[PDB]
């Protein structure tokens, strides 16, 4: 498991906020944590608000790709950049949406390695 385990509290206080604001449930987010992908407000919502949170994404979802690199382990590096060749530029209706069709294809190109906090 490449997750470490210092990442759980450090996202906690931010997490809560997201799903607060998004109607978030744990049950959404333990279903995208297992791959499975609809396009609800309340789930893709949160997902760009976590996002947001940590400077991973801007104000229309654009993703910051050397922060994201940056949080990424060594063995992670080459497949990331190869992930973002592909799923970047973001597309979508708007920054929720952008997040989901994001999602969607990241999941899909390395589903091994995927999660959803
Ligand atoms: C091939 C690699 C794939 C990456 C795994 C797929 C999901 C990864 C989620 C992105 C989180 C990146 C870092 C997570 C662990 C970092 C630990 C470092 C701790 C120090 C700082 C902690 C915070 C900066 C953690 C930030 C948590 C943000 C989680 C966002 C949850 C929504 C993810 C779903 C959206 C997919 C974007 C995906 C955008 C990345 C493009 C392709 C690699
Ligand atoms: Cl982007």
Same mark, same amino acid.
């Given at each position: ?23 978030? %449930? ?17 789930? %893709? *919502? ?40 592909? *799923? ?7 920054? *929720? ?7 969607? *294809? ?12």
């Amino acid at each position: 498991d490449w997750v470490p385990p210092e990442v759980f509290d450090l996202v906690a206080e931010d997490k809560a906020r997201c799903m607060s604001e998004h109607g978030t %449930t744990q049950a959404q987010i333990d279903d995208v944590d297992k791959g499975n992908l609809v396009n609800e407000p309340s789930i %893709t *919502c949160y997902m760009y608000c976590l996002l947001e949170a940590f400077s991973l994404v801007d104000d229309e979802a654009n993703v910051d790709e050397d922060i994201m690199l940056g949080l990424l382990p060594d063995q992670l590096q080459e497949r990331a950049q190869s992930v973002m060749g592909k *799923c970047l530029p973001t597309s979508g209706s708007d920054n *929720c949406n952008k997040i989901y069709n994001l999602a969607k *294809c990241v999941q899909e190109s390395a589903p091994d390695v995927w999660f959803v906090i």
